[PDB]
């Protein structure tokens, strides 16, 4: 939970512009669009990084390259790399960051319209963000289905396999015989229907507020390289203010930058602490932290 600024430069002033826009439009709400950057301070090992215990266990197992672990044809051929990843990443093995708790503060103040997330942690929900405000664009472990017929399975049947030494005898469907997996969106599958359907309602909400008060969309801790999520920032209305809190300028904010775009080069946890101070909400934050 302690943070520091990324460089000698202060970002307090940029962050103060953000707080200034919410003080001027006090019943306006914010849409957040987040990725793996916001969960780095929680100690979630990156499966692409050498140097993690996960990476070396997956290499030992003959995984050809990291993202094969999220590839349906590979999993069908050999489910063990996926099961080993799950055993290490499964919810309940980490705790939410100070950034995750900022979202829950924004909900308590009724200024959260929706969070769109690329992460399959579920730390937004664990932190107490309501179901109706979350869109887990790449799925989670909380549902499971037969890859062959779609039959539904409680998540606990897959869970119970991961506590076994060694892991063998994978979940198989009692109707068709194919593998059952978690509802994690693998590369090459479509996203859940609620992704497109809710962005459709929220795109319409963004346009209608510019003609009345004014809304804010803040993108944090993502490289905007995975589609179709990363088509979102380009689809934000021309007249709706966009903020990027990211170690680097990426995506549509580097390709096609907009006069009102605000870029803040800062660690998501440090961003959270500066925003809460520039908002005046120190007291209700502190209390959420110590529960």
């Amino acid at each position: 939970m302690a943070s520091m600024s990324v460089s000698t430069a202060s970002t307090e002033m940029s962050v103060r512009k953000i707080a200034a826009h919410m003080k001027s439009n006090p019943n306006a709400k914010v849409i957040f669009m987040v990725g793996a950057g916001i969960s780095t301070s929680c100690g979630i090992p990156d499966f692409r990084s050498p140097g993690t215990g996960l990476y070396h266990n997956l290499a030992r197992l003959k995984l050809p390259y990291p993202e094969a672990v999220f590839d349906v044809d590979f999993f069908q051929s050999d489910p063990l790399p996926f099961y080993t990843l799950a055993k290490e990443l499964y919810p309940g093995n980490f705790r939410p960051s100070k950034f995750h708790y900022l979202l829950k503060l924004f909900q308590d103040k009724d200024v959260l319209k929706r969070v769109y997330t690329q992460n399959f942690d579920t730390l937004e929900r664990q932190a107490g963000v309501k179901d109706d405000l979350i869109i887990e664009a790449h799925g989670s472990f909380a549902h499971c289905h037969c890859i062959g017929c779609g039959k539904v399975y409680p998540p606990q049947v897959f869970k119970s396999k991961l506590a076994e030494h060694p892991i063998k005898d994978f979940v198989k469907c009692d109707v068709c015989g194919e593998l059952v997996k978690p509802a994690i969106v693998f590369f090459g599958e479509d996203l859940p229907d609620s992704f497109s359907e809710t962005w459709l309602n929220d795109s319409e909400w963004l346009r209608e507020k510019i003609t009345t008060q004014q809304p804010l969309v803040i993108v944090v801790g993502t490289s905007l390289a995975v589609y179709p999520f990363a088509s979102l920032p380009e689809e934000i209305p021309r007249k709706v203010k966009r903020v990027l809190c990211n170690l680097e300028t990426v995506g549509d904010f580097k390709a096609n930058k907009r006069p009102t775009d605000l870029i803040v080069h800062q660690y998501s946890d440090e961003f959270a602490e500066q925003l809460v101070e520039e908002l005046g909400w120190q007291e209700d934050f502190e209390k959420i932290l110590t529960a």
């Binding site: 996203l191 179709p228 088509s231």
Partner: peptide, 7 residues
């Protein structure tokens, strides 16, 4: 919808 999860 946007297509399938890709780079």
């Amino acid at each position: 919808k946007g297509g399938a999860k890709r780079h």
